[PDB]
């Protein structure tokens, strides 16, 4: 049975993914069902679109890799899905004159990171993250772009990896992940050498633990970010805390 070779070095190149990535990447799409990776060329019904299935692996190559950061599935929205885990496309800039921006606050699971962050970093006394506080911080070292955010976690050697890839409805996911399921036991194989450690927000911990080749890495397990607790929780401090994923470069 005949294999989509070509069309999947393609998919990398629309992405802008290293050929670097092929050995570790190939395969691992490879696991994909034939007629899933015919509906994937489609690139019609899913989120994010097909230019960006592979978008967190366009800046990284393989060896720079020091973290790998799991979501579950691409956000909801199609201007939120943009390829990466964590990432909400909505969010441009960070601030306000007011504290957070508007699309920060939305963004539950941002808001309590960056927040968490601004604390970790000695911004922000932790007992105090309130918009008063964060309008009233000097702001002229720090990011101002969600883009630059992100750009920090590659900075760092976050992989951001979401289970599955691409998003078609909320009824969908659970099967989606599955058929993803093989794909990133095939890529935390092909990473076993590299030994990057991957970073578990709450029931991402649990899930992890089916997978084989998840137990030939070391793992840190946090509470996820939604929760408003994560803003003063230490192990993220101790965690995030070297990468200053807030600073501007």
Not at 13 to 29: F, H, K, Q, T
Not at 43 to 55: C, K, N, Q, T
Not at 60 to 79: A, C, H, K, S, T
Not at 104 to 125: C, E, H, Q, Y
Request: proline content about 6%.
């Amino acid at each position: 049975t005949n294999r989509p070779i070509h069309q999947l070095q393609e998919l990398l190149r629309l992405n802008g993914v290293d050929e670097e990535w092929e050995p570790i990447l190939l395969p691992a799409l490879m696991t994909l069902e034939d007629s899933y990776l015919e509906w994937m060329a489609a690139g019609e019904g899913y989120i994010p679109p097909r230019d960006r299935l592979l978008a967190a692996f366009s800046t990284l190559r393989p060896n720079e890799v020091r973290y790998i950061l799991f979501g579950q599935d691409p956000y909801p929205r199609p201007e939120s899905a943009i390829g990466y885990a964590f990432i909400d496309g909505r969010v441009r800039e960070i601030f306000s004159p007011r504290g957070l921006s508007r699309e920060v606050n939305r963004a539950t699971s941002l808001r309590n990171f960056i927040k968490m962050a601004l604390v970790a970093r000695g911004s922000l006394d932790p007992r105090d993250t309130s918009q008063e506080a964060i309008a009233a911080l000097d702001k002229t070292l720090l990011v101002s772009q969600m883009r630059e955010l992100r750009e920090n976690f590659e900075r760092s050697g976050v992989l951001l990896l979401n289970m599955a890839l691409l998003f078609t409805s909320k009824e969908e996911s659970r099967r989606h992940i599955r058929a993803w399921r093989a794909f990133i036991e095939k890529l935390l194989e092909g990473f076993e050498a590299y030994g990057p450690t991957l970073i578990l927000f709450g029931a991402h911990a649990r899930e992890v633990q089916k997978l084989k080749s998840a137990r030939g890495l070391p793992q840190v397990a946090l509470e996820h970010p939604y929760n408003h607790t994560f803003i003063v929780n230490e192990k993220a401090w101790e965690l995030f805390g070297p990468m200053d994923l807030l600073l501007k470069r």
